Amino acid sequence: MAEDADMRNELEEMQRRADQLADESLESTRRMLQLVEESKDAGIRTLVM
Amino acid sequence: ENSIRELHDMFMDMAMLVESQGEMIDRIEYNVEHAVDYVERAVSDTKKAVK
């Protein structure tokens, strides 16, 4: 023998959707963080008045 | 989020519903005790009108 082979190889990235399209769902989850609180804001002060 | 939009829009209804109703109480605000200002200040005289 007298054999030394030490080797390397390269990676295959699984198609993780591979587009920005993920953002739109992320935009919906923005808005549900965003547009919800003022309901309570005006709710508690509607209840004050 | 559309459920949110719907309840938030029914709530920008609601906050304004109770808002717009709210001032009618200020309309009463005169007629609740200035009305009393007529009633008691008058019957203090009706009871003195016999005299």
Nearest CA in chain B to A36: B4
Whether chain B has a CB inside 8 Å of the CB on A26: the answer is no
Residue A19 DSSP label? S
Helix (H) or strand (E) holding B26: helix B2-31
Contact A33, B1 (CB under 8 A): no
Judge: A35–B4 Cβ closer than 8 Å, yes or no.
Answer: yes
Q: What are the CB-based long-range contacts (under 8 Å, 24+) for B13-19?
A: B14/A46, B15/A42, B15/A43, B15/A46, B18/A46, B18/A49, B19/A46, B19/A49
Q: Give dist(CA B2, CA A9) in Å, integer.
A: 49
Q: Which residues contact B15 (CB under 8 A, 6 or more apart)?
A: A42, A43, A46
Q: Which technique? A: cryo-EM
